[PDB]
Design a protein around this ligand. Structure first.
Ligand SMILES: CC(C)[C@H](NC(=O)[C@H](Cc1ccc(O)cc1)NC(=O)OCc1ccccc1)P(=O)(O)O[C@H](C(=O)O)c1cccc(NC(=N)N)c1
Ligand SMILES: [Zn+2]
Length: 304
């Protein structure tokens, strides 16, 4: 039993990716871009009205296992897309002109572990040579000033950066896909919780991106837009000064690949519930986040 207003286990999310695609083949195609360490299927949903040489926006959720509202959002987004296409003018235009590559859960193995054993698990579930300690932090595992700051070289730590960039099957799979589709991908959006922020590069260094004024203006408008719905307040800015320095993140890596619009979203809340956000806040959290995501999309589309 899948529900968009409950957190769903992987078995249910997987069955959902099959069902939602089957029921909406004129708007969704499902491919697998690789397997996790434990052999689970890394699904990618291409959401859009099919057509030749379309530009794309890439969005993932579930980098971090315990951030359950992230996984919830990707599912919510997909339904909004399919239900409102042809009726809401913006979404109709969006899906006509571009594709959303939606990766609903990246770190599946960790997510399963938060259901079966440890709700506060963060990392992947890969083994590490020479120790019983498990897991690499996927968002320390990208080739972006890799492991030089805000990251641990110790496999027993929560921010373990891995043995090398893309040492994890899951991060290699994501990197490979984006690398193979660079010409088409115009924005990279990665969904996390919590903190209510929109961050842009850089986090691995205090240097600012060439278009940081544009990114600041874009982030500022998106947070204003998000707030219009329920009054939820977000902050925004470069990662390093806005939250903390940290190397090896996918947002910084995607930007350095030439994807000029790259954002990490941190959804509700600010720490009252933290990672354990009540299911009763799924709907409102997803609704307001939709506004910010659609705002950014509208901007990116208009600036092709
Ligand atoms: C609550 C979120 C802020 C998450 N952070 C955590 O869970 C961190 C991870 C961590 C664990 C041990 C340690 O020694 C240092 C850090 N843990 C934690 O308790 O966060 C609490 C907190 C809550 C609010 C603001 C700051 C910190 P996140 O989603 O993992 O944050 C991302 C990350 O650290 O990978 C993140 C946030 C903003 C930008 C980026 N991009 C990037 N390239 N670093 C990445
Ligand atoms: Zn996270």
């Amino acid at each position: 039993g899948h529900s968009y207003e409950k957190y769903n286990n992987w078995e249910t999310i997987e069955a959902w990716t099959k069902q939602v695609t089957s029921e909406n083949p004129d708007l969704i195609s499902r491919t697998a871009i690789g397997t996790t360490f434990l052999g689970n299927n890394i699904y990618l949903l291409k959401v859009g009205k099919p057509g030749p040489n379309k530009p794309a926006i890439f969005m993932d959720c579930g980098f971090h296992a315990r951030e359950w509202i992230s996984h919830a959002f990707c599912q919510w987004f997909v339904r909004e897309a399919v239900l409102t296409y042809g009726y809401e003018s913006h979404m109709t235009e969006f899906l006509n002109k571009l594709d959303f590559y939606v990766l609903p859960v990246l770190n599946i193995d960790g997510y399963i572990y938060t259901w079966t054993k440890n709700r506060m698990w963060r990392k992947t579930r890969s083994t590490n040579a020479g120790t019983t300690c498990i897991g690499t932090d996927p968002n320390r595992n990208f080739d972006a000033g890799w492991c030089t700051t805000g990251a641990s070289t110790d496999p027993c730590d929560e921010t373990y950066c891995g043995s090398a960039a893309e040492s994890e099957k899951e991060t290699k799979a994501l990197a490979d896909f984006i690398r193979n589709n660079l010409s088409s991908i115009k924005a990279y959006l990665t969904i996390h919780s919590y903190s209510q922020m929109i961050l842009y590069p850089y986090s691995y260094d205090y240097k600012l991106p060439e278009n940081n004024a544009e990114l600041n203006n874009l982030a500022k408008a998106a947070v204003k837009e998000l707030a219009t719905l329920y009054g939820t307040k977000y902050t925004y800015g470069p990662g390093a000064t806005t939250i903390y320095p940290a190397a090896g993140g996918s947002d910084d890596w995607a930007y350095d690949q030439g994807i000029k619009y790259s954002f990490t979203f941190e959804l509700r809340d600010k720490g009252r519930y933290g990672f354990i956000l009540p299911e009763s806040q799924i709907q409102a959290t997803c609704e307001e986040t939709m506004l910010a995501i659609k705002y950014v999309t509208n901007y990116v589309l208009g600036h092709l």
